[PDB]
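Predict structure. Chain length: 153.
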Amino acid sequence: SPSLIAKFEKTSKSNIEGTIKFTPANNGTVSVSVDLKGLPSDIGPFPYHVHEKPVPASKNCSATENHFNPYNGTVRAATPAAHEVGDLAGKHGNIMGESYKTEYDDSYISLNEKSRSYIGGLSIVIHANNGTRLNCANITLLDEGHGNANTTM
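Prediction complete.
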């Protein structure tokens, strides 16, 4: 299953830029690497989630609809597995600060296209602490080249 990436860009709407990368890991989990700057810290900390629809060409973060929650889960929970699949921040911590870099494994999202919990083609939205949507990015393929006879450049 191929690696994915969400690339955040700076616009008049938001100074948030950087990447969230998804790579398949050892324990049948997905390794998530967050590298962001330009955050408006004073209205944080910043919840972030996989949302159910793509970011349209307009860059309207509202158009991504709700959290990707195919397995009906809870907002706050005792165990990470009880959180919504797309609820990255709930399981792993909100983004904090003006710059934020972190790495963790998520056991719930999937890189396998044939999987229900597949997050390819969806979106990530970063929210202010009050829920306001600040910036968003589509989750797209990282590597250019695939197949068992191919290499990637």
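Summary: The chain is about 5% helix and 30% strand.
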